[PDB]
Structures are given as C-alpha cells and as structure tokens.
Design a protein around this ligand. Structure first.
Ligand SMILES: Nc1ncnc2c1ncn2[C@@H]1O[C@H](COP(=O)(O)OP(=O)(O)O)[C@@H](O)[C@H]1O
Ligand SMILES: O=P(O)(O)O[C@@H]1[C@H](O)[C@H](O)[C@@H](OP(=O)(O)O)[C@H](OP(=O)(O)O)[C@H]1O
Ligand SMILES: [Mg+2]
Ligand SMILES: [Mg+2]
Length: 237
C-alpha cells in the first residue's frame, strides 16, 4: 500500500487470481453504467475507486487507486478487522483451508479477527500499534478487552467512537441483510476515529476473495452481529 498526498492510496494487485479478482470487484461495483440498486448502495461503504493505475513508465506494474479513508483525520486511530466465519474461499485447496484455519482456529466461533490497530495516546502525543499476532491471540475470554483497547486513548475509553462504530456497522449489516448476490471471504472492516470529537469511518476493504452467490453471506452476518454485540458491551464499561 502506498500513500499519496492527493488523498488516495495505491494498492498493488496481489498475484493472480487474487489481484485480478479484486480489480474486477471494484470494476463491477463502480461500473459507470451500473443501475443495480444493491451495488449502488454498496458504494457508500467502500473506498471511492479511481480505477486501475500504473506508473507512466511501467504499464506492467498494476495498482488500484482508492480513497484514503484516513485522509480527513488529524490523528487517525485505525483498526482493521477481518470479518466472517471462514477466511478461505470456496475454491481453496485443503492446504489453504488448513493454513487459514490454523491462523485463527477461533474464526468460526467468533466471526471476526483483529488484524491490527494504531491508536493515538493523547498524554504522549504518540501512537501505539498492535500487529497480526495481537488479534490472533484473542480468545472468547479476552475478545472484549482486546477490541476495547482500540478505543482507549491512554486516559479514557472513547465510548463516542464505540457508539458511532456500532451505528455505522449497523448500516453495513442492513446492506448484507438485503443482498444475496455476493459473498465476502477474507474481507475487512477498516475503522477510523479521530484521536486528537465525532468523525468516524467504518469502510469495507480488501476484496481479493469476493464471489458471486445465491445465498445470504451468513458468515459475514454472524461476524458483524457478534462484533456489534462486543462493541455494545463495551458501552457498559
Ligand atoms: N482505502 C484505504 N484507506 C486507508 N487505508 C487503507 C485503505 N486500504 C487499505 N488500507 C490500509 O492498508 C492495509 C492493507 O490493505 P488491504 O487491502 O487489507 O491489503 P492486504 O490484501 O495486503 O491485506 C489495511 O489494513 C489498511 O490499514
Ligand atoms: O498475515 P500472515 O500471517 O502473513 O498470513 C496471511 C494472511 O492470512 C492473509 O490474509 C492471507 O491472504 P488471503 O487473505 O488472500 O488468503 C495470506 O495467505 P497467502 O500466504 O496465501 O498469501 C496469509 O499468508
Ligand atoms: Mg487485508
Ligand atoms: Mg487481503
């Protein structure tokens, strides 16, 4: 991921089939001639898409040019959370299924996995970050405190940002409850709040494993509902 000062990010296409699939996901949703109401609403929850991009001197080198969801913040606090009961897609080999389940065998039970976070601490005017091994070390017993950490700025828990997050996830959940045409594996919600105070973003990102479907994405629903339940209990702290 490359950050550009024009308020965008450039995401390098992953090797095939993943990179091509994500490109085609964005091309589908943001198709200029799209009048599918489900896809038009979905746009609200994704980064704005500016199309494929390459360097003028390197057509081989493929990126997606996307809205940088953090751009409008002064001290953005960011968390990436993978959503769903399965982080492997319908065409995964046994090996890949085993890889992905062994990254976090609790995915079926919890329905989400924190991939990382960067949190602004007001007293020190500095950031603390957690990596992939943080959220993968979270159990049912520790998931609530694990998530809460994102919203604590070194002296108070930001219940405003927790409540806003629930409210935004709720709209995404509603989108999911009214579509049966796409199922999302290994996708994420990107959470941003202002660390320095009410602006909050929750956007869907990372679409290398989105597939057409004829069913509700029950894994994705389960994950969102559980994530909301956790966030709700944090409001009682
Ligand atoms: N549109 C965006 N705006 C701001 N930050 C982003 C955006 N897309 C990705 N990021 C950051 O880059 C990270 C990796 O992006 P992602 O699409 O999840 O790539 P990967 O396929 O490598 O998991 C995310 O966790 C997030 O922190
Ligand atoms: O973060 P880690 O521990 O390096 O593990 C990676 C993480 O689970 C990625 O989401 C996954 O890509 P997908 O989500 O696209 O499967 C990748 O699979 P890969 O090794 O097959 O690229 C893993 O290696
Ligand atoms: Mg990702
Ligand atoms: Mg990915």
């Amino acid at each position: 991921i490359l950050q550009h000062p024009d308020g965008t990010v450039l995401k390098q296409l992953q090797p095939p089939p993943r990179g091509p699939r994500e490109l085609e996901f964005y091309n589908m949703v943001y198709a200029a001639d799209c009048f599918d109401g489900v896809l038009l609403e979905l746009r609200k929850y994704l980064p704005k898409y500016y199309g494929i991009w390459s360097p003028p001197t390197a057509p081989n080198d493929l990126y997606l040019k996307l809205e940088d969801v953090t751009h409008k913040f002064n001290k953005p606090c960011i968390m990436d959370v993978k959503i769903g009961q399965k982080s492997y897609d319908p065409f995964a080999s046994s090996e890949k299924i085993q890889q992905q389940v062994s990254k976090y065998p609790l995915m079926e039970e919890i329905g989400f996995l924190v991939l990382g976070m960067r949190v602004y601490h007001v007293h020190s005017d500095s950031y603390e970050t957690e990596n992939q091994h943080y959220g993968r070390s979270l159990t049912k017993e520790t998931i609530k405190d694990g998530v809460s950490r994102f919203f604590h700025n070194g002296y108070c828990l930001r219940k405003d940002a927790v409540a806003a997050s629930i409210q935004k996830i709720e709209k995404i959940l509603q989108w999911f409850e009214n579509q049966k045409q796409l199922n999302f594996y290994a996708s994420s919600l990107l959470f941003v709040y202002e660390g320095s105070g009410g602006e909050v973003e929750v956007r869907m990102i990372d679409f290398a494993h989105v597939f057409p479907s004829n069913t509700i994405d029950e894994g994705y629903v389960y994950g969102l509902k559980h994530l909301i339940s956790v966030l709700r209990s944090i409001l009682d702290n």
